[PDB]
Every structure is written in structure tokens, then in C-alpha cells.
Design a protein around this nucleic acid. Structure first.
Ligand SMILES: *O[C@@H]1[C@H](O)[C@@H](COP(=O)(O)OP(=O)(O)NP(=O)(O)O)O[C@H]1n1cnc2c(N)ncnc21
Ligand SMILES: [Mg+2]
Length: 772
DNA sequence: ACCTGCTGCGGAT
């Protein structure tokens, strides 16, 4: 049993002098990779998955022309960190080679991202590196230019953090780029995927390899986390101060000053800039200084120069704290970071495991992680998150099926340089995972829209007698300036693409002391998943029924600290005192009260996430304007639905038959604000909207105007591929209709209770749903 | 009172 016996003597001798022994994930991965199989490596953050995917390819490059290895990272910071960390093995091979009198190998390593200056991009095409590190977006650019000629020799493709794109149109974008690559090679490259958070393994492996078989490497995972949920104030409902931020910022500086290097994660860029300002202002007042800053920001809007210095000073431990977004969530190996702080509950359990994983990033080390709730109901969010992280209960991922807009974009790009065979392009598309069942009718339908069908611009010419697609002038410049799959989002700061007479684009689509509508806020993308929503209610119900003893025991195995136990107990007690019972996975609560203006307000309490409450609000809305004649559309969130009715009220308003749900949602989604937004993002991603400058993505006000003016014409044609895909994304990717159906099935089974209660003043849970 | 998510981002003249 020798995992290093396969490699040459030099690489074997180096790895022995560098590490005590390979990890199980390395030994298994080297076996599968060396035998030629596509391999998905599933192991915790301290497992050495980088060398698992790289070392065999490195050994072959060391053995006595063109880019040979292609590493793809979803994050730029990780891409640069991999380049720096590959210096240790390459430097070691050289030391060992020369120790034994052999000539040193020359292995080049390059990084191609958006930060690469033009002159360096030209140097990387004239002299391509043996190991190319890049992003999915940039891989798309090289495949849609003369740079692809350097990729004709690629033998290995590493897709790091494959879970981060598997369930998105960004990964479908990546899935097609890789198939376009395989068509540039004599032999499709070997594909290797890495992730500590894979569920289900078989589906992520299907995303990585498409139709090719995948050896799944997933050895027994032992990763120790030291998690903690700290609440600095004794009562979040009655704060001595204007806000909870001052006491939170205090404990963070306390935690940073107590640890060598810490990463503080914020769920937005503005909050990261804010906290960095606060943490420095606190550190200065404590140290009599007006002298390095204690903390510095890292996120997408930071320049590359400042970003580079933050990563370098973090790599060396010079920087004691960095306040980052998800730009540092994955992969980075900062040996000086022994603490990760998460402000607010993270967007998912998997991300919390990835973020906290940055700390203790060595084999066998513990990852220390502290979560700070922002408000009362966020404390439950952080607790459930810590709970699921300790048991590894992450979300189940599902590859979006047949995303036609992603296809249309690649179709312009694959034919931007040459004429492509429609059959061959279809054959390659079906080899990817997201299009394995693509109907040929949908394929030709997409080509028709790109060619011939007038507020849009077609970008290709289709010869059906020959089966050939050719590009119209500027197709390449259109594809390369597209930006990929990530959509242009933006908020109406008052009004842009105005309607005068900050707000969410969807809230805006639904346009002194008089009753007002509550601004609907979609944080970003889909919302809470149904399985995690169930876990939230089961946590709330369980802990709201424990004597203080079992309660305290339960909180301490989550790492509750400060006053987290007091505030959770008080929160559930007060919610119990207000509605008798607390909402849970088995009991929904319908709460009713009258506004100070005399208007009724009926709130549905349920933890099952926005993916279920989104479509449920559509159904309630249809009934409200049909059965009651009220056109005000209800506000939906992760933790329930808010309805407002002028004074004339029941819970049967929310209850529907299981077979009634899916048809209703299908009929209402076409007029909803979500569909208008996702039709715009789809139309732009398909490269069909007219832009203001050929080599520049049109401003958001202009996308909206042209997309809205296009939809008013496309509504007339229900078979329009953009309409089809917009409906496809809303119902399958945003909503979770199967979850909404079984929820109604359970309510019909009398297995999900419902309680009507009238309150004199909003309960704690109702107060939270009202703007906070 | 939390004061309303991120990721990435031309090329050929
Ligand atoms: O060189 C590595 C690094 O310093 C850490 C962890 O290695 P990673 O390659 O970053 O492991 P992961 O990619 O899985 N981390 P994440 O899931 O991306 O977050 O340990 C070093 N290292 C590698 N291999 C070993 C062995 N065998 N022993 C000790 N340290 C090792
Ligand atoms: Mg990794």
C-alpha cells in the first residue's frame, strides 16, 4: 500500500520530505486520476485536495508543447492563491532533481482573469503556460478568440469548488465551455472536481463529466469545527443603545485582538466597507493612534491593487483582520488565519462550512468560527446553521435543465470565429449535463431566434439546407463583452428607468399618514431552501418546549456565548405568549391584527423559505382579487407571507388543494414582477437585447426599457424561447413547487397544523417580518 | 430594530 509508488522517484522524494504522509483523499484520488478516470474528490477543507488534483499532472510534466493543465476557479482570489501555492511543489521537485544530479524541470504557471493587463494577455498567448489558471468567464473568452489555439494540447482539467457552480447557469455556462474545449482536442481532457460540500455526489459528478463516467473519491471525513454563536447584548428587544452594532463591533475587535489573523465575512460589500471603518475606528481609540490599520476590506469593488496587497499581507500574517464578502469564501490557504467570524447567518450551510474552513487551514487542525446574529430571528438562523454545520446537513443541488439562454450565448460564441455545423453543435451541447435531454425542437427554436423570426437584434445567419450557422458582423465582440451568466442586478435609488410621482426592481414593478405597502425585498437569487426551512421550524418548535435545563444543554453544544441563551429563550417565550404556540415544521400560525389606521393585517407564519412562499403568494393574490376583490399583492419572505386588507380575515386564505397549486402558479407567474425581471436577465444573457454601444453591456435602465418593450410583443407568442426559459427559471430554479405541493398535501392530511390567532399588537415573529 | 446579499467582466485593428 504505497500511494506515491506510482509517481517518479523525484516527486516521491519531495512529497516525503514535505508532508508526514498523504491523506486518504490524496491516496484515493491519485489512484483514480493515474488510471485515467474523471475524478470527483469529496473531502473536508483540511485534506490537501489541491495536490490530489495537481501532483500527478505535475509528475508527468516533470518527466523527461502548449498549455497542458487547465485549472478553473470560480473566485479570482483562489486562482491567485493556487498560483502562489504551486510554487512549493515545483520548487521542491527542482531541489530534489538537482540533489540527485538530474536537470531541473521547467514548469510554467500562468493566471488569466479579468485583472490581467492587455500586454500580459498577449504574452500568455505568445508563450502559453503549462498550467493555466483561470475562471469560467475567462475560459469562455479564450475559447471565443485566437487564444483558444493554446488550449489544443490540454490533457487535464481541474474544476475546483465544483459545488459553487453546479446548480447555476454559471456552471451550465461552464459546462458548455468545457465541451467546446473537448472539441479542440484530439481527446477530451480528463476532468477533476474538488469540493468539501457535495450533495448529492452522483449529481455533482454528472455536472463535472456530463456523459463520461466519474470515479467518486469520498473517504471518511473527520473535520473538527469549534463553532460559537455570540450575542453581546442581554436583551435584543430592549437595547440600551440605538443599535446592536456597537456591541457587536466591540466583541469582534476583542476576538481579532485575541487571535493572529481573522476573516470577518459580511453578506454585502457596503457592510464590509462599513465594518472595516468601525473596526479601525475602535482599534485607534484603544491604541492612542490616529500605524497599520487593524482591518482592511476585500470584495469585488475593491481595486485589484488593493486586493492584491490584502491577500499578500494576509498570506504573511501582517494583516490581523480582513472584512470580506464571498470573494474569500473558497479555497484560499492562509496559514495565519486561526479565526473566522460570520456576521449574520450565512446564505447556506455549505457556505458556512466553506467560510469557517478558511481558519485552521491545515491537515488535522480545528476551524474556529464565531457567528454574530444581527437581530432576534437571525439568532435562530445562526443557531440552525451551526447545528447543520456540525452534522454536515448541506443542501441538495440540482443542475438546471435545458437553460436556453445559456445555449443561445454559446451559440453566438462558438460560431463567432468560424462556421459551425448545427448537428455537431447539437451533439456537443447534449454531451454536457444541463442539456442531456435537450429536445432538438428547442435547439432549432433557439437557433431560429438567433437567426430569423422587431425590438431585438439577431446575431447569426442560419443555412438550413446546409445546416450551417455563420456570424453577423460584431458577433464575437458581442459575446466577449457579454460578461457570462451572472446577471446585471441593480436597485432603484428612487427611480432609474423612472416612474416618478432605494427599492427592489421587483418591488418597483408593482407601483403623510395613510396606509402604505411594505417594500418587498429579495436579498438575492432564490431564498431559503425547503429542507433547511423544515429544519428551522423543527428547531423552533423543539427548543420552545424545553425546561431551562434541557434548553441550556441544547444551546451549549452549539457554542452559544454571551447572552445567546437568554435571548433565544426570551424570544420563544414571548412568541409563545403572543400566539400561544410558535411556528414550526408541523404548525403554521396565521396571525391577525388591525393597523393603527384601522386596516387589517393577516400574517402567515412558516419557516419553509421563500421558494415556497413566493408561489404561494401568487395563489393568495389570485384569490384575494377574485374572492375578495383586493388587488394589493401580498409580500412574501423566507418566514411567511404578509397580507393587508382594509377593514370590512381567515386562515383558509392560504390553504389550497395539492392538485390546485401547480396550475395556479403556472397561470399567475406570467404577470408577476419576478417574471419581468427574469425575462430581462434571460433576454440580455441570450444576447438579444439591443445595446447602446456594441462593445459595452447596455446600462440597466436600457436593458429594462428594451426588455419590457420586447416582452409586450413576446407575450403574444407563448412559444418564444425567451418566454419559455423565463418561465422555466422561475418555476424550477426560483420556486420549489414540489415542496409547495407536499406542504398542501400535508395540510390536507391534517399532518401540518394551522392555528388562527388575533393579537392586539404584532408578535415578535410578526414584528420581524415587518421591516426591521 | 437588521435599515435590505455575492460571485466575474473584449478582442482584433
Ligand atoms: O498545501 C496544503 C495547504 O497548506 C493545506 C490544505 O491544503 P488544500 O489543498 O488547500 O486542501 P483543500 O483544497 O481541500 N482546502 P479547501 O477544501 O479548498 O478549503 O495543507 C497542505 N497540505 C496538503 N497536503 C498535505 C498533507 N498530505 N499533509 C499536510 N499538509 C498538507
Ligand atoms: Mg479545495
Amino acid at each position: 500500500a504505497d500511494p506515491l509508488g506510482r509517481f517518479s522517484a523525484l516527486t516521491r522524494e519531495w512529497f516525503t520530505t514535505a508532508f508526514a504522509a498523504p491523506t486518504p483523499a490524496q491516496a484515493d484520488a491519485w489512484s483514480a486520476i493515474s488510471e485515467g478516470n474523471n475524478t470527483l474528490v469529496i473531502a473536508p477543507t483540511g485534506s490537501g485536495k489541491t495536490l490530489a488534483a495537481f501532483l500527478w499532472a505535475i509528475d508527468r510534466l516533470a518527466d523527461p508543447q502548449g498549455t497542458q493543465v487547465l485549472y478553473v476557479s470560480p473566485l479570482k482570489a483562489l486562482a491567485v492563491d493556487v498560483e502562489r501555492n504551486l510554487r512549493t511543489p515545483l520548487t521542491g521537485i527542482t531541489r530534489v532533481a538537482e540533489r540527485h544530479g538530474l536537470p531541473a524541470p521547467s514548469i510554467t504557471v500562468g493566471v488569466r482573469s479579468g485583472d490581467t493587463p492587455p500586454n500580459q494577455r498577449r504574452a500568455m498567448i505568445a508563450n502559453p503556460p503549462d498550467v493555466l489558471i483561470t475562471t469560467p468567464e475567462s475560459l469562455f473568452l479564450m475559447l471565443t478568440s485566437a487564444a483558444r489555439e493554446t488550449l489544443t494540447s490540454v490533457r487535464t482539467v481541474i474544476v475546483d469548488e465544483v459545488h459553487a457552480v453546479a446548480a447555476t447557469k454559471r456552471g451550465a455556462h461552464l459546462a458548455l465551455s468545457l465541451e467546446r474545449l473537448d472539441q479542440l482536442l484530439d481527446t477530451p481532457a480528463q476532468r477533476i472536481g474538488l469540493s468539501a460540500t457535495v450533495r448529492p455526489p452522483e449529481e455533482v459528478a454528472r455536472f463535472l463529466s456530463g456523459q463520461a463516467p466519474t470515479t467518486i473519491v469520498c473517504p471518511p471525513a473527520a473535520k473538527t469545527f469549534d463553532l460559537s454563536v455570540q450575542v453581546p447584548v442581554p436583551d435584543m428587544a430592549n437595547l440600551d443603545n440605538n443599535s446592536i452594532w456597537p456591541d457587536v463591533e466591540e466583541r469582534i475587535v476583542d476576538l481579532v485582538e485575541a487571535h493572529n489573523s481573522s476573516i470577518v465575512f459580511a453578506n454585502s460589500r457596503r457592510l464590509a466597507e462599513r465594518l472595516t471603518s468601525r473596526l479601525n475606528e475602535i482599534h485607534a481609540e484603544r491604541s492612542g493612534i490616529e500605524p497599520p490599520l487593524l482591518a482592511r476590506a476585500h470584495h469585488g469593488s475593491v481595486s485589484k491593487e488593493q486586493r492584491a496587497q490584502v491577500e499578500d499581507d494576509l498570506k504573511s500574517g501582517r494583516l490581523r483582520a480582513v472584512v470580506a464578502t464571498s470573494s474569500l469564501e473558497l479555497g484560499i490557504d492562509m496559514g495565519a488565519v486561526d479565526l473566522v467570524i460570520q456576521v449574520e447567518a450565512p446564505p447556506s450551510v455549505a457556505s458556512g462550512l466553506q467560510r469557517v474552513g478558511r481558519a485552521g487551514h491545515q491537515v488535522g487542525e480545528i476551524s474556529q468560527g464565531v457567528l454574530f446574529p444581527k437581530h432576534r430571528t437571525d439568532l435562530i438562523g445562526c443557531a440552525v446553521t451551526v447545528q447543520r454545520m456540525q452534522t454536515g446537513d448541506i443542501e441538495t443541488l440540482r443542475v438546471p435543465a435545458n437553460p436556453l439562454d445559456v445555449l443561445a450565448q454559446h451559440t453566438v460564441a462558438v460560431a463567432a470565429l468560424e462556421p459551425v455545423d448545427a448537428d455537431a453543435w447539437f451533439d456537443a451541447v447534449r454531451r454536457s449535463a444541463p442539456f442531456a435531454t435537450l429536445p432538438r425542437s428547442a435547439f432549432e427554436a433557439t437557433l431560429d431566434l438567433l437567426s430569423g423570426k422587431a425590438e431585438l437584434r439577431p446575431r447569426l445567419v442560419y443555412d438550413r439546407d446546409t445546416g450551417t450557422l455563420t456570424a453577423r458582423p460584431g458577433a464575437q465582440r458581442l459575446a466577449v463583452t457579454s460578461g457570462g451568466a451572472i446577471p446585471d442586478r441593480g436597485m432603484f435609488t428612487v427611480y432609474l428607468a423612472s416612474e416618478t410621482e432605494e427599492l427592489d426592481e421587483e418591488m418597483v414593478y408593482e407601483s403623510p399618514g395613510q396606509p402604505a405597502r411594505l417594500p418587498f425585498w429579495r436579498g438575492d437569487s432564490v431564498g431559503r431552501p425547503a429542507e433547511l426551512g423544515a429544519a428551522v421550524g423543527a428547531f423552533t418548535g423543539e427548543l420552545a418546549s424545553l425546561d431551562r435545563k434541557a434548553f441550556d444543554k441544547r444551546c451549549q453544544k452549539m457554542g452559544f456565548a454571551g447572552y445567546a441563551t437568554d435571548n433565544l429563550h426570551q424570544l420563544l417565550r414571548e412568541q409563545r405568549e403572543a400566539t400561544g404556540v410558535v411556528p414550526s415544521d408541523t404548525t403554521f400560525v396565521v396571525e391577525r391584527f388591525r393597523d393603527e389606521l384601522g386596516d387589517w393585517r393577516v400574517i402567515l407564519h412558516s419557516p419553509y423559505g421563500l421558494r415556497v412562499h413566493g408561489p404561494l403568494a401568487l395563489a393568495v393574490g389570485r384569490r384575494l382579487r377574485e374572492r375578495y376583490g383586493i388587488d394589493e399583492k401580498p409580500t412574501a419572505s423566507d418566514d411567511g407571507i404578509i397580507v393587508r386588507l382594509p377593514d370590512s380575515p381567515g386562515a383558509d386564505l392560504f390553504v389550497f388543494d395539492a392538485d390546485e397549486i401547480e396550475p395556479i402558479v403556472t397561470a399567475e407567474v406570467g404577470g408577476s414582477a419576478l417574471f419581468a425581471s427574469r425575462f430581462r436577465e434571460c433576454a440580455a444573457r441570450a444576447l438579444l437585447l439591443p445595446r447602446r454601444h456594441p462593445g459595452k453591456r447596455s446600462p440597466l435602465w436600457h436593458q429594462r426599457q428594451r426588455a419590457a418593450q420586447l416582452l409586450d410583443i413576446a407575450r403574444k407568442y407563448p412559444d418564444f424561447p425567451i418566454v419559455l426559459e423565463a418561465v422555466r427559471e422561475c418555476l424550477q430554479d426560483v420556486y420549489d413547487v414540489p415542496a409547495l405541493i407536499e406542504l398542501m398535501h400535508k395540510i390536507a392530511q391534517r399532518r401540518l397544523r394551522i392555528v388562527e390567532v388575533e393579537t392586539a399588537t404584532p408578535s415578535p415573529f410578526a414584528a420581524s417580518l415587518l421591516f426591521g
